[PDB]
Every structure is written in structure tokens, then in C-alpha cells.
Subunit: 219 residues, 6 copies
């Protein structure tokens, strides 16, 4: 399926790309485009360079706000699969040091610059966004991004879609800490009523609660 | 979020109030307003006195059928949090003896009058409603209320919303008997195709079946 | 509830019949009508002879393409409950040899003719449909049917509806192999984006993935 | 394997009989012989009439205290499989009314006399033993027997052996209440340090705790 | 820990070797030496060539019945880790064709000769032993070996030790079929009261039953 | 039951005290006495002051090596229930700062001195013992103690007894991290073949492995 753009709020757009992975077939991955004054910033690549180049072109030609910089929410190919495209298209890329290290271990290109959030609960302000490291969950390095004007929380792959009980790709997950990481994000951003998972539809805070439940160690 | 009213059938309305509870945020609670000839009856308060007073005012001014009496489906603050408002507004309140006893233990005000349904499976007719005690489930005292004109079954908190697998607040639950209590209610009221949970959207009998499954002891 | 017809694609219709089964009440069962040149073929009966006769009549009078033959996807009464009606109405019925044997053991009438797909993974072409035996799942004999013009995969009862975690009627299930059988079907028919379960709404490939997850042996 | 006798305390003996049940093979069942002044009483038959007759003969010839009466701890064939032998050998048999009713439903002979313990928690003194009905567990009618001189608690099949996590034959079990029934027995007889399960070795109170854990509804 | 020999029955000995595997440390692996007229046969190597050579030497010097041939119960290094030693010491090695193929895939040396048991339930007589392929379990190729004079069933790694609930190394397991494979072995060899797991102490049929329970798909 | 002493190795003794806790009854708690030149050190109190005073007296009168100092492995009453006795008897008590803080929160007396091991994996040498903080498990502050002459690892309550699947008192447990904490201890002390849990019998490394399994987040 081709690459789709949907408006989530004032100056906040979701990009969605698809990849066919047998046996189940097409799987979506979502990220964001965030408008700033006369440029935009990007949260996550799509699956590959071609899809990522389509996102850059859309921001330049449709929003008229070319992508200047990007952040990447963990070291997997749905979030960093299009790094060569971003680099060739002049986008200045950012990730945590741990994400960059895991990217190299996993055969992905690291970002060009470092987000200094290494402790659990650490937050910074980057291009009008709040970036939090809530601890390991879907991947040890996963970060979340909050946009405080529209109160949109981008949970990425740490937040599971809808009412699923499937945990998704758990190859790199911290099964012990994931539910606490979700609680940490939910407590850090109480005003965000719109929550974006990477692999499903935009939703509300019910997907925070559901994710924390389905990934929580039980008695 | 403010207090909402939705029509479910002839003379049957749902009231919904919200409370912000970290980490997950707003949580709805639902109850009913049931029209009678020139007055109405209430199933459950909302979370607090202010929301409950808004329900009384709506019945008086919008339906023109002031609330005369109420029933309360178990001793938690989403169902009995607005008792002082009901009492001050002249509403005559009813609950089972067990609910009244648990209300006192839990720091809530008991109802002024007793519903005589203490045995499992016992039912009475109260203001045109059938009230059943199906046994302990979400709380040991939980009762259910059936409105037989429109065939609406109010399951309250004993029925979980939608397709969730979360059990909600289980602090006071009877985990051994809950699925049997749901079966008891479903068998008692086969004609009710509309089922109302306290913490989600109106639905059909699929939420009876799903609740019984997700709360059933497994092998 | 009465018997319903819904168009799924060019020349492909879903039939749905209901049965009241306490405690939960009405349960739907779905099958298909597949148009051919001047006749049609049927996938599955409804619950009983009366509902099945209504399907035959609809194909004759509304589609003007009378049902000539049928296939049955496993030996339970939602799929073979209307065999006497089909036989009396001149429909030539087909099932696997294992389905016919299990039908007799279960008190159902067997089909008049045999589908030769006894090995796991075996497929045949029957009236423009691909019929696959993917191995035991909901029932040891369950088969799936793919319509390759519209790319519709009829999973029958081997595919669970929506986002449920309930396994349905497991009296005859192969709990060890069911998730592999679902994977086998999904790998055999990658182009089918429309998936039909017997007991829920038409959906996409997400119900293949969800079924395989909820029925998969866990660690 | 043949029928075995082991001394558990002053005047208290365990009888053990075996039955070959494929696939796993021999399975033991245990009961007790309790000496009184110049006669004895029996707790449970063995699997069949021949084994039960061997127990009667042993009490008469070895203890010199012929069995006068018996109690039966629930309606399954390991506990009531030898009723014809007891009746022919002049033993006066006792069970609860519920056990007698379930015996008839299950194709076993009922006892000749009734133990009046129908409410949960009800206890009586019978031939120097305390008999408690703790509620449904392995079977809805299961009772337990405490011998207060030696402080031996006969849990029968309601108590699982050793450190197993298997629940045994659950065809007739009350999965919701079983762990509470075990707690009820443990609270009723705090001084009993010797605990006898039907299907394993004599042990201590650790098998009460383990049984309650492995059969307890979990979150 | 060094290599140990223990007599299990007339002409049947267990060999046990140890390997230190962090974090848990020493892990035993067991196999058998089976005496024949003036030679012996071997079931499984130990972990490595040195331990396996010690087994060959013990049979030659202590039993005075040199090992002529061997069978290997699946393709893992505890069972086939000492193949070079056996081959150099003149032992003629046998395994199923599937075991030989999986050995090559897993970096182990295959056996020199083939055991023709490829269908589930197939059995052959080899050097007075019955060898059964019961279907996939701990590994897809696992076979079991029964010695009918002493009625000793060697379950190898398909049978878990004692009362554990741990499944051991499941990297290559068939989680769907394992409990059925255990049932198949138990039904094939009802007279064997001594059961040998690879990674624990000799035991009785209770470890067949426990293994089947702990590895069985649950509802 | 009264207070028991058992020799575990040269200069290393286990002390065991009992407390009756309904419904299950007596529960043991274990700690150690470690001989040094002409004095000893203590690992953990018993349940109360009287039992703890008996341990001090035994070291003075039987070993002739009076207890000079003690360490406490977490803030629960089985480990710190006898602090007043130790303090009155002149024993100099040590615990981590986190244990002292949790002791105060839980109504126990803190130790007089601090063990400086606050980071996960931190170790110190104290009176010839290695003390490790492996991360939260049974309690967030739990530490383990290794005696390297006899290679005895005292796991305290972080290690569950025998082959149980019960988690014990989990009121204060870190369910996400406990299995990793056990792995951390097992990796830190590979030479210790004797492992002491607080609530069961001395055992080997199998109880490390079993604990890590039964408390590990599963898929
Ligand atoms: Cl979604
Ligand atoms: Cl809902
Ligand atoms: Cl659906
Ligand atoms: Cl036992
Ligand atoms: Cl063992
Ligand atoms: Cl123990
Ligand atoms: Mg540049
Ligand atoms: Mg008044
Ligand atoms: Mg004809
Ligand atoms: Mg008589
Ligand atoms: Mg040769
Ligand atoms: Mg001093
Ligand atoms: Zn990822
Ligand atoms: Zn992802
Ligand atoms: Zn409630
Ligand atoms: Zn509620
Ligand atoms: Zn079916
Ligand atoms: Zn069906
Ligand atoms: Zn029984
Ligand atoms: Zn029994
Ligand atoms: Zn293996
Ligand atoms: Zn092995
Ligand atoms: Zn503790
Ligand atoms: Zn403890």
C-alpha cells in the first residue's frame, strides 16, 4: 500500500508507510511531521528510503515547510529504515546515544546527533516537543514524544494498537519493565488525549492503559 | 469531562460522569434514569455530589419527571459517590443490606432503604424494573437491573466494556464466582439485547459473553 | 434474527443465519454464495433446513443463478445443519472424506461427494475456488476456501472474529496445531485482504494474525 | 499393585489401592481405618469391591477391630467404588445427602445413611472424628475428616499430592471455589500437621498451601 | 563433575556426564549402556568426546562387553556431542534420517546409519530394544527407547525431570505436539515403570504424566 | 516449633526459627552464623526477639564465638524481627541504606550502620563475606551473601524453596526484575553449589534456576 498523510492537529501530521511481511501481509508504521515557523521536523522514518523520500517531498511541496531535522524513537527498521534518504535530503537526524549504539548493532545507520536523555524519566525540550526516555519496553532504547500545543503523545512502538492482546515484535523487548515504562509516559503527559501507536490507528488514552495491562507481569 | 445524557430507549436514559484518575486519566461511569408516570427513578449516582446534582436537575427540568427514588448497584464511589446530593435533593435511596454494610465499611453513605435480595438468584420487581442479585463478581454485593419494556440490561461494573481483557478495579472482586454471576444474569434476562456496562459504551450481549470469558477460571 | 445477505465482491455474497443458544443468545453463522455463469455454488449451510432453504431460494429468485453444488468447511451444525434441505433442493454436496466421517460420528448427514484434500497443505481447484486443507484447528477436518477474483479468503470457524480472545466452541479443536493451520492458510493466500470468519463480521488479515496469536501455544 | 496398609498414628491406618488407567498407568487411592474400642471405622473404599473386601478382612484379622461403619468423602469411584463389598460385609455406610445424590447421578451406590453437613463450614462429630463440609473443590460434595488425637487431617481428593501443579481429574470440580475450600479446611484444623491426600504420599501442611495456590484463580 | 555409571537393571546401566553452562552451572545428561551377549550397545553420547571416550572405556574394561553400536535420540550436543569419539573408537552409530539431517543443520556429525522410523507411531526392534518415533516434542526428531526385559523406558530429553515446571531448552521444540508425543510413548510402553529423563534422576511414570501436563496446550 | 541449628560447612551454621501464621501454620525462616577467629557474625534475625536471643546465646555458649555484628538481607520481619534483641545484646547491625529506609516505612528498626551497595551489581567484602545487591526481586532492597571458603550462597527470600511454583509473600516484590536479579546472583557466584533460601531446605543451584523460571515474565 502507498504512503499516506493524515492531519492530527494544528501543524501535526501523521505519515504512514506499509511493508508486506509474510505470513500476515501489509503492516503499517506511523510517524509524525511537526510544523515549525517555515520548516518542519520529522518523528521517525518510514520502512525504507523510497517511502521516507516521499515524506520529505510532501513536507516541502504540500506543507511548504521543508523537513530540517528528525528524531528517531528506537533502533528498528520501521523507525530508522530510511536514514540514507534523510541524510541525502539534508535532514539533520537525532537519536539517543543508546539508540545509535543499538542501531549499529542491528545493522541500521545511526543518527548524526545525540539526544541527551539516558536516565529513566529524563526529558528534554527539542523543537517545541518534549522527549522522554521512560525506560525499556518494546525496545530498551524506546523514547516517546509529546506535542504540547495539541496535546498529542506519540508512543511509537512502545504503545500497542487498539484492543489487541498481541505484543508484536518482542525480539528486543524488556518484558519486565515495559508496563512501568508505559505508566511513566502516561504520568509524564496527563493532558494528552490523543495517543499515536506506530502499528495501528490514532486513539485515546485507552491504548496506554490497555498496553500497560497486556504487557504487565501477572500474579 | 462534563456530565452527558443519552437516550437508550423509550423512557430510558443513560447518565455519564467522568473522573480524572492518574495515570490513565478520565474514566467514565454510567447509570440510568428511568421514566415513570410523572416522576423518574435513578440507577446509580455519578462520581460525586456535583455530578449527581446535575443528573437530578436534568430529570426535573428536561424530562419534567423529577427523580423520586434510586437504586445503587454496589458499594463503590462511582455508584454511591453522590449520596449526600441525592439525600439533600429529596431522593429516596435503596440498596441491598449487604451493599449498605459494605458502604459503611468503605466510607460511603448507605442507602436509606433495603432491597430484599440476599440469596444468589433472588429477584424483585421495583418501580417496573427487575433487580437480580446474581452472586459476587466485581464486588460481592453487585446487583443487576433489567428494564423489560425496552429489554435493556444494566450490568453496571460487573460487566466489562467492549473487547477488553482488563478486569478493572479488582480490589473487592470475587474472582472465583464472577463468571458464574455473569452467566446467572444472562440466563435470567434472555430478551435483553442492549447491555450497559458502567465503564464503557452501551453494547449487546457480546459483552456478557466476553466478560464471562475474561473473568472465568481457566484450566 | 432472520437470514441476511450481503455483497462482498463481484459475484460473491455472504449468507448469515442466527440461532439462539443460552446463555449468550443469538449467534450468527456465515457462509458464501459464489456466482458462476448461469448458476451458483454454496459454501456452507446455515444452522437448519429452514434457513438453508431460504438461501437456495434467494440465489434462484434474486441472483437468478440457482445453487448447483456446495462445499462444507467442517462437520458442525452451523456448516452442515441444513444438509437435508440442500439434498431435497437438488444441490450436489461436497466435503472431505474426513469431514464426512466426522459428520456421521457427530449425527450430521455427510455430503454426497468427496473433496480429495487429505494431506496438510493439499489444495484443489473446485468451481473456480481454491480449497485448502491447512491441518486441524477449530476442528480436525476444517478446510478454507479462497476466491481469487476478488481475493476473498473464507476462513470459516477456524478464524475467530474481530479482536476477541475467546476460542469459541473448542470441543473438537486441535489446540496444538490450530495456530500453525492459520499460518498455513495465510501463507497459501497472501493476496486475500478480505477474510470471512463464520461467527463475526467480515474483516481483513488482522483477524488471521489475531486468531493465530490467541490460539498459539505460549511459553 | 496390591493393597497396602501403613500406620499413621495411634489407632490410625492408611489403606492404599491401585488401578491401572492408561496412559499413565497405576494410580493409588488412599483412605483410613480408625480404631475405636473393639471395632473400627473406615474412611473411603478402595477402587473396587475386591480391594475393599481386603481392607475389611485386614481390620478384622490383623487389628482385631472389625469395621462397623464408614464415611465417604465424595462421589467418585476411588472413594465409593467398593460400596457393594461394604454393604455385603455388614458395614453401615454414611455420606452427605449431596454425595448420595451425586453418587446416583454418577452410577455409584449411595451410602445407607446421611451426614448432616450441607452448609459451607458445617461440621459434625462422628465416631470421634470431625467431619467438615468446606465447600466445593475437587467435587462439589467433597468433605474432609479430621482425627484430633493424632491431629491427622484427611483431605482426600480435594488436596493434591506433593509439589505437583496438575489438578488431577477436574471433570466435576468447582474451579472457582476450590482454593477457598482448602483455606476453609486449613483454618478449621490448625493443629493437624499430618495431611493425607488421596493420590499421593502422606505429607504436612505444605500440601494444603500448595493445593490452594495451584487451584487459586489468578490475576 | 566427572562421568558416573549407575546400574538400572540387569544388563542396563545409566551413564551421566556434566557440563558447566552459566548462569545455572553444571547440567547432567544421561544415556544408557545395554549389555548384549559379549558386547554392548549405547544410547546417546555424553556432552563431548572426552566424556564419551570414558563411557566406551568403561564398557570395555568394567563390563567386559565393548560397545559395538549406538543410537542417538535427537540432534543436540548432549546426545551427539561425542560422535567423533564413537567413530574413532569403532562404534557403529545409528539415528533417524531426520536426526541426521538436523544434526548437519545444527553443526553436529550425523550417525553412519539410518533408523527407519519416519512416521508418527512407527517402531522398530534394534538390538533387543524397541525404538519409537512418537512425534515432535522437545525436538522434532526425538525418539524414545524401551528395554523390555527390565521394562525401562528411556525418554531422553522429551521427558522433563522430577516435578519441575520448566520446559528446558525449547529452541527446537514442537510446543503444539509435545504432550501428545509423551502420551504416544506412554501408551506404547505401558509396562515400563522405570523412566529415564536426560536431565534428572531416574523416576517412575509420574514424570511422563507431569511432563505431558506441563508441556500441554491449556484452555 | 523451637529454634534449630544445623552445620552447613566449616564455620558456617544455619539458624531456623518458626512462626505460626494462619491458615497454613508454621513457617520457617533461615539465616546464618559465620565463625571468624574468636567471634562470629550473623546473617539475619529470626522472627522475634526471643528467637534471636536464643541464636546469640548459642553462638556464645556452644560455638564459643560470640556474635559481634550482623547483616540483614531485606526489610521484612523474618529478617529484622529481632533487632531490639541484637541491639540489647551488643551486636553491631548493618544493612543497606535502602533496607534501613524501607525498615522505617514498614515499622521495623533499622540497622545501626550502612552497607554501601546501592547500584545493581555492586558488591563489597564484609567480614570475609561477599555481599551483592542484585537488583529488586522479592523486595526492592534484597541483597545476597556469599561465603567463599565453603562456597555457600545465602539467597534469603529472593530464592524460593525446592520445586515450588508459589511466589510467597509478593506484597513488596519487583515482579519485573526478580528473575534478572536471580540471574545476576547466579552469574556473580558460579562456584557456590550450596544455596540457602529463607523459607525451605538448603539445596543446590537447581533452586536458583527454578526460582528464576517461576518468577520470570512469560510470553
Ligand atoms: Cl488500531
Ligand atoms: Cl467500550
Ligand atoms: Cl466481529
Ligand atoms: Cl506424593
Ligand atoms: Cl530429577
Ligand atoms: Cl524446601
Ligand atoms: Mg548537511
Ligand atoms: Mg425526605
Ligand atoms: Mg439429484
Ligand atoms: Mg446390616
Ligand atoms: Mg569401522
Ligand atoms: Mg554497643
Ligand atoms: Zn520496534
Ligand atoms: Zn515497530
Ligand atoms: Zn465497583
Ligand atoms: Zn465501577
Ligand atoms: Zn465448528
Ligand atoms: Zn462455527
Ligand atoms: Zn474424585
Ligand atoms: Zn480421587
Ligand atoms: Zn535436546
Ligand atoms: Zn537435552
Ligand atoms: Zn521478605
Ligand atoms: Zn521471607
Amino acid at each position: 500500500k502507498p504512503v499516506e498523510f493524515v492531519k492530527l492537529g494544528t501543524g501535526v501530521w501523521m505519515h504512514t508507510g506499509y511493508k508486506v511481511v509474510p505470513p500476515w501481509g501489509n503492516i503499517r508504521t506511523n510517524g509524525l511531521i511537526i510544523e515549525r515557523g517555515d520548516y518542519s521536523v520529522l518523528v521517525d522514518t518510514a520502512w525504507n528510503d523510497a517511502q521516507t523520500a516521499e515524506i520529505v517531498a510532501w513536507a516541502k511541496d504540500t506543507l511548504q515547510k521543508p523537513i530540517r531535522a528528525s528524531i528517531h524513537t528506537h533502533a528498528h527498521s520501521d523507525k530508522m529504515g530510511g536514514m540514507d534518504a534523510l541524510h541525502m535530503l539534508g535532514v539533520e537526524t537525532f537519536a539517543t546515544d543508546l539508540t545509535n549504539r543499538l542501531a549499529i548493532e542491528r545493522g541500521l545507520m545511526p543518527a548524526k546527533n545525540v539526544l541527551n536523555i539516558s536516565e529513566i524519566g529524563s526529558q528534554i525540550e527539542w523543537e517545541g516537543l518534549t522527549i522522554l526516555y521512560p525506560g525499556g519496553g518494546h525496545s530498551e532504547d524506546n523514547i516517546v514524544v509529546n506535542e504540547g500545543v495539541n496535546n498529542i503523545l506519540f508512543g511509537g512502538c512502545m504503545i500497542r494498537p487498539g484492543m489487541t492482546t498481541s505484543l508484536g515484535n518482542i525480539d528486543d523487548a524488556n518484558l519486565g519493565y515495559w508496563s512501568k515504562a508505559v505508566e511513566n509516559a502516561a504520568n509524564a503527559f496527563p493532558d494528552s488525549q490523543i495517543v499515536i501507536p506506530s502499528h495501528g490507528k490514532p486513539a485515546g488514552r485507552e491504548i496506554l492503559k490497555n498496553t500497560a495491562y497486556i504487557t504487565r507481569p501477572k500474579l
